């Protein structure tokens, strides 16, 4: 269980940005390359 | 102090959940209800490929987006010219139970594997006019489920022994073993910079790994069944999962939690293959209901249905330039859609 | 069309011819899948992965595949095989065999896939039946300690365990030691499936 | 006494039914040997059933009010398509017998290429009869359109190679097929399986019975004319047309693959 | 990979002879096979072609009706039967392999060739330059001209470059332009369009002296051009 708790501790101490920032990044990537998408 | 260790693990999981909930302040539907819908995109079968005489289980596109490799149950690995329907190569395999196939980015090698627990690397460019077995990577304990190339000498594989592996092809040795999953790892996807990769398993979880470090950075758990497909967003900072619970889920790596779920009440069937489009706006998911569906990634609305396969669609891939989507099903047929 | 493209099309036609002749050569083969808990090695000719055993009988080629949880991950590979040879020890374990037959004979892909069920270790079961009563694992027998009656009872909860017994058929055969008996039994079974497939293809059935 | 009205109304009904059935069949065909044989039988039945006017008008007005090109081409078509349909039924029976009683080698024998070769050979052995008809096609003097001991030998030959050998093959192949399917597993000791076996037996006896009772009186009438007037002959021709009308139904609508 | 030719010698006019070529080192059955010819003091000339599996047979106009091309795949041998020889057939015969698909390298290996001595429309490939001096370490440009545009509708431009060293069989440098053959140093480049074509050597060495030949593969009978000879 030592490996499990070490992995959980390493996962907990992680820099997490706001979810709205990630969603806005996805919108920016989609809109910046929408003209170069020949399926939509 | 086994109970103390269990309590510490539970407290760490609770802290992770609390941090993830604190990161959530606006659902993506709220920020996405303003954008215009993509409409009713209809794709037609521009090409059909005949010659396989058993169930097709895998395909992989090329970097040139014209050469295709497909694996079937008759022990056959066929390299096709997508434009002219010509078969470039018909490689006979030692084992007929192939479940995955890959095409090297340089175009000189093709990989295959399956129930034989061996990743076979085939050289396509020889002084002789034949395709020869270049390597037989062995060391996995369970069935080989997915293999993806990084370069001509490195390849990452996933298996049913709950591990992912990195191989130096020339030495043919286990460079790095990736450990931490509980269930069978079913699919792999590689980042555009080829430094990180994500694996989905049968323990209803996905894991992000550093190729150069051999450690698991993040674990994502949203589903409730076996995850069968995985694919990065074209950004490389997000990915999408599909499972047997008739549900797709888009996760973001920096937000460290699920951002969107794609599901419908009418859709009750497993998911076999998920891939994105070039811009990341469009998600394509193959199902067990004999056809494929096309979701909008920024708003979970089923934009389209690709139908025409007489059996379960087993694999699907999108070209690098994004001008073709090729699907392979159990009716021994490949179809290129545009 | 260019000369090189014409020659490429001719090469593709040659590959088509080789694929067709390979299919014609391989169409005389029967897909058999061997499963069990327990005598899988006693039926082959009476981390590696699969084990392919190829044997010929009366102008039929047969290929048995040994694949010895979460068995549903690779079970779609055998969704079109001709037959499943299941092995079970009368002198076994029994609960595990019943659970495996639960998972196999009621599976989604094997609703119309025939089962040839072997009840092996008959001498061991004959020695064990007189010593240990049937109540060690199934305390509902309340019957004679005869070897034939014990075998007939243990055949149930295996053959009566299936559902939808109108489409598929389960064949039962105590594993003999006369060499060419079990292979002849499997030959007769696959002949039955081949007759059914021919009837369906002709469309009169 | 009101005979000629109904006995040509039945010809009109037979022509309509045959045309409708032959148009309905082969539409979904536009991969298996049975489909090829069904298509060939459909073509034979269509070109048999298309020959309504050249006998309905003959029985209407006792003459041959058509040119002498007709009195050769129509008769060649008649003999050709009659032999084609009969031999196609025979080959379907042999195909079923091979598929059941010889299951291991039916995998190799029942190739679509082999079925096409057999169909082409049937076409050639019917074209021989067509050539024999087109050579001897000639009118006589009312205007009776026929062929001019050679007639007796021709009738004996067409009876031998058109009724008795095909019906014997039908009987033998189907009785061996049924006797094999009675002893086979998956159709013994149940309810739905026995129902399917009885359905197979009923369909087989139906097709053999309709063949015999609907191709026998015309052959018997021709052989008794060889070594209240003509109504029985025209009725025998009526049953001869009903056979070609009814075969596409029994071989397409009662087949599960169509 | 070896293609060893046998046969040849002195034949009187009107005679017959059979040339054989043994292939050792590659899958002979999967390669289309060509017979090419060189007059003793002149350039190259196509003679015949046999497909993989002998499905397609093609001949030149001069050898038509007199020459037969065949192959024995289990014997790994190629055959040319020559009847009614004239005095214009005194030449050295090379046997060439060529596998055909988009991205393959046709005409990539050539045989040694055998000498035949006898006693007593078509796309014209033009190389006006001949016998041009070179200096080691410099850059050499070789021009090539055609009569029909070699750019097909699929984007493929069918110009092939070959190098006949003194006393050596021709090599292959470029098969389609800007596609460099295997075993060739990265100083050879090819560029052109339609009628005009250029080969560039950035820094030639002592092993890059010889005669450079053009070939069109757009349509048969696969005409070459009179080469450009490099001289130190
Ligand atoms: C032993 O049976 C024979 O020999 N048959 C030879 C063909 N048949 C004819 O009646 C030919 C004929 C004669 C006169 C005229 Cl005007 C015409 Cl149009 C046609 C007999 C009956 N048909 C009915 C349609 C298909 C079979 C059978």
Numbering used by the authors:
A (entry chain D): 12 to 51
B (entry chain C): 3 to 340
C (entry chain B): 5 to 41, 44 to 52, 181 to 202, 206 to 229, 242 to 354
D (entry chain A): 56 to 85, 91 to 201, 207 to 213, 221 to 299, 307 to 337
E (entry chain E): 2 to 121, 124 to 235
What does the paper say about this structure?
KOR is a highly desirable therapeutic target for treating not only pain but also addiction and affective disorders. Specifically, opioid receptors primarily couple to the Gαi/o family (Gi1, Gi2, Gi3, GoA, GoB, Gz and gustducin (Gg)). To further understand the role of KOR–G-protein coupling and signalling, we determined the structures of KOR in complexes with four representative Gi/o subtypes (Gi1, GoA, Gz and Gg) at nominal resolutions of 2.71 Å, 2.82 Å, 2.65 Å, and 2.61 Å, respectively, using single-particle cryo-electron microscopy (cryo-EM).
GR89,696 is a potent and long-lasting KOR agonist that produces antinociception and dysphoria but with unknown hallucinogenic properties. For example, GR89,696 in KOR–Gz also forms H-bond interactions with Gln1152.60 (2.8 Å) and His2916.52 (3.3 Å), and, in KOR–Gg, Gln1152.60 (3.9 Å) and His2916.52 (4.0 Å). In particular, the receptor conformations in KOR–Gz and KOR–Gg are nearly identical, although the bound agonist GR89,696 activates the two G proteins with a 100-fold difference in potency. Whereas Gz is predominantly expressed in the central nervous system, Gg is the endogenous transducer of taste receptors, such as the bitter taste receptor 2 (TAS2R). Furthermore, R1563.50A specifically reduced the efficacy of agonist-mediated Gg activation, momSalB (WT (106 ± 3%) versus R1563.50A (38 ± 5%)) or GR89,696 (WT (103 ± 3%) versus R1563.50A (46 ± 7%)). The observation that several mutations have the largest effect on Gg compared with the other Gi/o subtypes suggests a non-canonical role of Gg in KOR-mediated signalling.
